[PDB]
């Protein structure tokens, strides 16, 4: 019995080039609770990422918020890289800042 | 007017890795409240949110005490578990439990709830009777019998129809600046072409507090619910939550959809179009 | 505030 994360990347505010924001990863819907997740910026781990306390929905699967402050730039790439059981190899999520 | 207070517990089997794991968060409706971690450094009840500070030095101890002595009792839950499905003690397993109350405008009960899973499925339900169970199978069944011998579902709307709705009003008092304001969501429509002949109309809403929302496209009036993407509600970080809902639609039809938001911060629903 | 008691499965 186990359910594999779906993943959101997105910023707290509307992104703006040099403007200091928030980066996302929500990592919802998931069981067991155990996950592994890494905030990246050009491929590279962000140190020192956030995350919310573990919680779940009704369904009884977990969801998490890990966080970090970024200033976004043209070139600057951001991606989300999550693992758990349900998964063969990391799945990487790039922010897109129009989802 | 409705408010809920639930706490959460997750209790995690790690085989060789010491004892098993015990968390417990406390929401109000959708504010965080208190967390305890069984893993923390030196483990406690603590403060999520500001208004919930003000409570004492005895209130800190009591919540602490009940955690730690609720960490040991899922820990023996577990056990028992292993034991009611016949399984090894080298896998690892989750309980889970979900318990609270909600309370109406007048802050009278509205509904209890205490209710466990194990490894993510329904095991046993406190029924809306606050008297009876519901066992989702044989295992459950077994402790359904020993609540019952032991008058666990009295005991249970004993805290429900008291101190968990007492303490949820005192709650909703002192954190009413930010419990009691509603946050209406911030609302456009984007257009991205995807081909000559199609394009995404986006239909989002932002910084809205608390979570539930509806946000619908109609195309001609009629509500596209198969063809909408809808996003999962997301947290900002702020309190406050995030949802999106797409449709993709033929060049030149744009203007016959609408996006409708309704939510709780809002006088009416909001009706959008993309504004070119 | 918590419910004190908890019962055993």
């Known amino acids: 019995i186990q359910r594999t994360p779906k993943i959101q ?39 020192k990422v956030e995350h919310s306390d573990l919680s779940f929905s009704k369904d009884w699967s977990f969801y998490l918020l890990y966080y970090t402050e970024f200033t976004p730039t043209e070139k600057d790439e951001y991606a989300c890289r999550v693992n758990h059981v349900t998964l063969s190899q990391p799945k990487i999520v790039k922010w897109d800042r129009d989802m | 007017g409705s408010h809920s207070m639930r706490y959460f517990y997750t209790a995690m089997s790690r085989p060789g890795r010491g004892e098993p794991r015990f968390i417990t968060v406390g929401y109000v409706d959708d504010t965080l409240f208190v967390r305890f971690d069984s893993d923390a450094t030196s483990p406690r009840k603590e403060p999520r949110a500001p208004w919930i500070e003000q409570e004492g030095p005895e209130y800190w101890d009591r919540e602490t005490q009940i955690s730690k002595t ?19 003690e080298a896998g690892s397993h989750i309980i889970q439990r979900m318990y609270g109350c909600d309370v109406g405008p007048d802050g009278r009960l509205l509904r209890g709830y205490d209710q466990d899973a194990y490894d993510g499925k329904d095991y046993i339900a406190l029924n809306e009777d606050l008297s009876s169970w519901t066992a989702a199978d044989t295992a459950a069944q077994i402790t359904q019998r020993k609540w019952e011998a032991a008058r666990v579902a009295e005991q249970d709307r004993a805290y429900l129809e008291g101190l968990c709705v007492e303490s949820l009003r005192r709650y909703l008092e002192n954190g009413k600046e930010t419990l009691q304001r509603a ?16 394009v995404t109309l986006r239909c989002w809403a932002l910084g809205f507090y608390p979570a539930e929302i509806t946000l619908t496209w109609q195309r ?5 619910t198969q063809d909408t993407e809808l996003v999962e509600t997301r947290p900002a970080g702020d309190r406050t939550f995030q949802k999106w809902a797409a449709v993709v639609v033929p060049s030149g039809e744009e203007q016959r959809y609408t996006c409708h938001v309704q939510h ?12 070119p | 505030e918590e419910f004190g008691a908890a019962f055993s499965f």
């Open chain 2, 220 to 224: 001609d009036g009629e509500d596209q």
């Open chain 1, 9 to 47: 990347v997105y910023s707290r505010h509307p992104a703006e080039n040099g403007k200091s924001n928030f980066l996302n990863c929500y990592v919802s819907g998931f069981h067991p609770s155990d996950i592994e997740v890494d905030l990246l910026k050009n491929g590279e781990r962000i140190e």
């Open chain 2, 264 to 275: 709780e911060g809002l006088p009416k629903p909001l009706t959008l179009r993309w504004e």
């Open chain 2, 183 to 198: 946050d209406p969501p911030k609302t456009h429509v984007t257009h991205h072409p995807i081909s000559d002949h199609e």
């Open chain 2, 70 to 88: 609720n960490t040991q009792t899922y820990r023996e839950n577990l056990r028992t578990a292993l034991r009611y499905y016949n399984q090894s």
